[PDB]
Amino acid sequence: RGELGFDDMLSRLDSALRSESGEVLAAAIRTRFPVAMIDEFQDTDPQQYRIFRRIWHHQPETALLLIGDPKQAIYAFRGADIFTYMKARSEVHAHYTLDTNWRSAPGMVNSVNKLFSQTDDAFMFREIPFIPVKSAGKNQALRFVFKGETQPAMKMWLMEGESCGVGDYQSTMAQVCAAQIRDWLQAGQRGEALLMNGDDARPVRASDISVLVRSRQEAAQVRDALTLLEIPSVYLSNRDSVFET
Amino acid sequence: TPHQFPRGASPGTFLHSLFEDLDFTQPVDPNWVREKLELGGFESQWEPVLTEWITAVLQAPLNETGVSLSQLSARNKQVEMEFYLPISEPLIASQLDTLIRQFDPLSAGCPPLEFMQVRGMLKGFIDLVFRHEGRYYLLAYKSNWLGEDSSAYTQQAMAAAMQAHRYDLQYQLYTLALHRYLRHRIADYDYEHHFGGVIYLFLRGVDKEHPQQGIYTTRPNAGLIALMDEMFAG
Amino acid sequence: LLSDLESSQELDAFVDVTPDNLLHNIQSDILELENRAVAGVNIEEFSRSDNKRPLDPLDSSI
Amino acid sequence: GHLASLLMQLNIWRRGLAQERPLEEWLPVCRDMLNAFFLPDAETEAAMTLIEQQWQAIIAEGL
Amino acid sequence: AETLDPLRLPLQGERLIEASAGTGKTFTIAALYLRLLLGLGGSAAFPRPLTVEELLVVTFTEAATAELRGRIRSNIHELRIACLRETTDNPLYERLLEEIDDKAQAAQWLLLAERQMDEAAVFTIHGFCQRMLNLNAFESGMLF
Amino acid sequence: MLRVYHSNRLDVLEALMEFIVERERLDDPFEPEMILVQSTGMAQWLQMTLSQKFGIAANIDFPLPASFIWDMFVRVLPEIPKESAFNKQSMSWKLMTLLPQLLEREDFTLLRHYLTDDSDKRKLF
Amino acid sequence: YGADDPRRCSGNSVSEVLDKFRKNYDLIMSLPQETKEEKEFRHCIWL
Amino acid sequence: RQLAPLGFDLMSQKPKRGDRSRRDDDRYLFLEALISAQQKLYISYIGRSIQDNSERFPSVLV
Amino acid sequence: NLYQRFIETLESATTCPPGLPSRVFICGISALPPVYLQALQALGKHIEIHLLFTNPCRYYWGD
Numbered sequence A: 001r002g003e004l005g006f007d008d009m010l011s012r013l014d015s016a017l018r019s020e021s022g023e024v025l026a027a028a029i030r031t032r033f034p035v036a037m038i039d040e041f042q043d044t045d046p047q048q049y050r051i052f053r054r055i056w057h058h059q060p061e062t063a064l065l066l067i068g069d070p071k072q073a074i075y076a077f078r079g080a081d082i083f084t085y086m087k088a089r090s091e092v093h094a095h096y097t098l099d100t101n102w103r104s105a106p107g108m109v110n111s112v113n114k115l116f117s118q119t120d121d122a123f124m125f126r127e128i129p130f131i132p133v134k135s136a137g138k139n140q141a142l143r144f145v146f147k148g149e150t151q152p153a154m155k156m157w158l159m160e161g162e163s164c165g166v167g168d169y170q171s172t173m174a175q176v177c178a179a180q181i182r183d184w185l186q187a188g189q190r191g192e193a194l195l196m197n198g199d200d201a202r203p204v205r206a207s208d209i210s211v212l213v214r215s216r217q218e219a220a221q222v223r224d225a226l227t228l229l230e231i232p233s234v235y236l237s238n239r240d241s242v243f244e245t
Numbered sequence B: 001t002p003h004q005f006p007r008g009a010s011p012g013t014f015l016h017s018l019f020e021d022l023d024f025t026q027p028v029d030p031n032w033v034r035e036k037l038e039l040g041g042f043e044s045q046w047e048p049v050l051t052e053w054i055t056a057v058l059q060a061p062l063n064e065t066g067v068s069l070s071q072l073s074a075r076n077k078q079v080e081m082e083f084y085l086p087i088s089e090p091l092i093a094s095q096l097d098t099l100i101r102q103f104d105p106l107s108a109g110c111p112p113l114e115f116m117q118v119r120g121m122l123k124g125f126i127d128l129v130f131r132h133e134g135r136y137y138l139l140a141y142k143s144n145w146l147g148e149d150s151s152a153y154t155q156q157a158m159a160a161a162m163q164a165h166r167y168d169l170q171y172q173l174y175t176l177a178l179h180r181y182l183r184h185r186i187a188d189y190d191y192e193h194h195f196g197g198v199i200y201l202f203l204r205g206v207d208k209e210h211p212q213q214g215i216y217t218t219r220p221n222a223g224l225i226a227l228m229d230e231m232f233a234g
Numbered sequence C: 001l002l003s004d005l006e007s008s009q010e011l012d013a014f015v016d017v018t019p020d021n022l023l024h025n026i027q028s029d030i031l032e033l034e035n036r037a038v039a040g041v042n043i044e045e046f047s048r049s050d051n052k053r054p055l056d057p058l059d060s061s062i
Numbered sequence D: 001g002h003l004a005s006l007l008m009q010l011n012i013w014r015r016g017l018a019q020e021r022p023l024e025e026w027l028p029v030c031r032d033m034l035n036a037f038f039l040p041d042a043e044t045e046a047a048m049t050l051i052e053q054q055w056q057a058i059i060a061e062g063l
Numbered sequence E: 001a002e003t004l005d006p007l008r009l010p011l012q013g014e015r016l017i018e019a020s021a022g023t024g025k026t027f028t029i030a031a032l033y034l035r036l037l038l039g040l041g042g043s044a045a046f047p048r049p050l051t052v053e054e055l056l057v058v059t060f061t062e063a064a065t066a067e068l069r070g071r072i073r074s075n076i077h078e079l080r081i082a083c084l085r086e087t088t089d090n091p092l093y094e095r096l097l098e099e100i101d102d103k104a105q106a107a108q109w110l111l112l113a114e115r116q117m118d119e120a121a122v123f124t125i126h127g128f129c130q131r132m133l134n135l136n137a138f139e140s141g142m143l144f
Numbered sequence F: 001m002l003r004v005y006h007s008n009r010l011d012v013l014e015a016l017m018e019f020i021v022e023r024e025r026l027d028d029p030f031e032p033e034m035i036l037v038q039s040t041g042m043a044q045w046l047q048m049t050l051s052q053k054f055g056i057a058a059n060i061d062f063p064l065p066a067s068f069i070w071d072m073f074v075r076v077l078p079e080i081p082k083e084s085a086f087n088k089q090s091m092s093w094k095l096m097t098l099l100p101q102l103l104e105r106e107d108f109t110l111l112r113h114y115l116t117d118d119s120d121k122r123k124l125f
Numbered sequence G: 001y002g003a004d005d006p007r008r009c010s011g012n013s014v015s016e017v018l019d020k021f022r023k024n025y026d027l028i029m030s031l032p033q034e035t036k037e038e039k040e041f042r043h044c045i046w047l
Numbered sequence H: 001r002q003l004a005p006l007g008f009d010l011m012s013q014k015p016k017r018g019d020r021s022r023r024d025d026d027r028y029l030f031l032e033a034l035i036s037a038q039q040k041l042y043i044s045y046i047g048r049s050i051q052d053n054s055e056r057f058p059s060v061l062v
Numbered sequence I: 001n002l003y004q005r006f007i008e009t010l011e012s013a014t015t016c017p018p019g020l021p022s023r024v025f026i027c028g029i030s031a032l033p034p035v036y037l038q039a040l041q042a043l044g045k046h047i048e049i050h051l052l053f054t055n056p057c058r059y060y061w062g063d
């Protein structure tokens, strides 16, 4: 049919580079793009690394910058592999690191550092060592005040009981999350709950609250209970079709 | 036979395209007619006959000057001329039909023109324009199947068909266009001196036996042309 | 290319545009081959905004 | 009986169009296919003529 | 493993930059892009200054690609304005200005880049593959 | 002589064209006027404006620069065909024949690797 | 520069340009062609 | 609108004055549209996607 | 190959060749190949050619 697909695109480029004429093709890509910067390199397929190596490995006057975090390699289901990332990590001599966290309050950074320092080799891979990170000076003032009382950066809601089933766990946690989000919204509508950078503040709108879920049925279980309280919500990963309504 | 030739929009366009690229100063070529019938897809049986028919068109005489289409050189002819005529004030059917009926009997025979007000431009394609003896003419091809017999292509029947398909207004507008173009181009132009009339050529009506059958000749009144020009101008 | 023609005789017939609108201001800036934007290199130039041209609030040309 | 008459045609042509042919042999194919499969009408005649014209132009350049 | 300074990072051969979350991995892309456009760093710099069309950036998602393209555009604009004014309020731009030898030529190159930003080569992996196949269907052996 | 008219707006140019047409008349009435345009909309606008000014616009040829240049080739020099032998459409079918005959050459080695796996001459075409 | 020359038809409105051209049509046509050096000199003076 | 050269075209390697490309053609069309506007110029573009409430951007010309 | 011969024929032609139109207008075209400009310059001797060029800037803005 003369058609083509994503996996077919990658496989065809790889085959071309591996073939006899691919050498010429390599120059065609190398002269075109002297420097290439790959981001989110932890999610990498063996094909992609073979291509990048074939093109930019040892030729002069051509740089290559790999930027990635192995602790975030979560696309294994999609064909990505962490082992090829570690292979690349072994094949590269130079390594560079960023020390400070610029994203979140110093509370969240300390919370994460404490939770991942419990055991040794937490990620159970010898090539993935965990180290504590330090927050930046800009965020030292960040706080979240709820009903006049500063809330802890991280709060774990423990369910009650000895043995809890999967369905009971899902229903109870969905209900609890719905109730807590409703309380946050009610307290922010009156100007009490504020996200504060030093003296500046702003109420907690229904937009800044995000619920991270793993599966579709999980998201629907969240959304149903959240709409039971007449709270507007939307699921960004919704792939349903309009015609099914 | 030409009368029994297939008719329609595409047959008519093919018949016109034949003359569009036909050289009048040379005899018809059989291979060319065969190729055109191959393009149109018609039967090759027409190829011997149609060629002859084409010559019957080229050699047929015209208005009393006696002009043959073969006598027209490439310098004295203009085929498929496109014209643009502006109409400034709105053109009312009643305010025009009255004048056309006043100066033309064909309009007087027919019911009044009916169309909505129009202001803007007017487009049109004149089939042929040619000059003979320093006198210009207008030639319009028509392939409408008036009748099955040659009597349906006589003077009275041709005038009846003109009145039925309202070709009167058509040739009147064509004459206004030609008049304005000649006045624009020809230095020291005069209507009566330089204009020669209008010639409707019915292809199927063309017969070597009868000179009158197939051709129709009519000259619009100069007063009608002047009043129509003034009406369309303001 | 047009300037490089040897046997060419050219006359210029332009029409000046009066800057009565924002759109006419832009067209006049283009026609007169002059630059109106202020970069603000000087601190005195950067402080005051009078160097720019007044824009009428009701104006809706662009 | 009508449907079975269509498929029969659909059979014949699907055997005729398989083999490769020189350009001059491709000339009558379009016309035969049009007149066999289609019964023209006032509106469709324009499209059919355009089809024949483009096909003839392609094969004419080729020849 | 060494601590990373965007201005001192050498751009030659293969280089791996690994860090934890929210540490500014993506944010460093813009600084490296500006360094490449202006050819700054001396010994650590590229041998020659480059153009927008010769820098390849590969991201994971389309939305991230659009975000990064817009942010690079904004950074080029702000750095050009700073070069024209010779002063700035950001520490990164301040260090860059300290590193730049001639500011007028730098502003000219930044202007050209800003005008060519429509042709910025910021793709995903699949888009990069498709584009390299189409631009080189002759060598790859594909259809046109 | 070749006279170039510069104007920031088109209406001035069109009115200059009008005045030049009216000033110097064509001797032969059947000689068509020559106006080069690369778009049909431009020709449509020129016609609608010229008709509005003069009273009617007709016998105005609107050829493309390439077609006009070839027409001038035909008229100035003898023994020149009506249509050029080398055109975009015919060079296609000529190269389609020529390419298989030249694959054995060394210079076309790359092309060979391109044309090795074609089945119905898709790559060739 | 060049205002006295009949060639220049630059004006404030379309009608003024058309009239300035119409009055000096014959004078423009009769004038001999400008030399390339003269054209370059005029364009340099205008800049 | 972007239409890249074939890649084995020799013109785009060493270009000269007068060589035409789609990019320059569109960039000049945008200037023609501005210059030809006599009274009002209206420009529109999609800012946010209706489906995802994402953020789109305007052309470099705008 | 025809360009140079066409230019040289009119360059050395003592009188105007027959069949050429009186005058030509070039309106609405802001881009032409240099070869077409050379041909029109060589052809301008015999017949007059009026180029209507919409120029957005008053002054000389090319190079």
Ligand SMILES: Nc1ncnc2c1ncn2[C@@H]1O[C@H](COP(=O)(O)OP(=O)(O)NP(=O)(O)O)[C@@H](O)[C@H]1O
Pocket: A069, A102, A103, E020, E021, E022, E023, E024, E025, E026, E027, E028
């Ligand atoms: N040098 C810096 N100065 C100021 N803010 C910074 C700096 N580096 C990063 N940030 C900010 O830090 C936040 C997150 O940085 P980011 O570039 O996304 O790191 P990241 O590695 O991409 N996080 P992630 O994508 O989850 O791995 C943004 O708000 C940036 O503006």
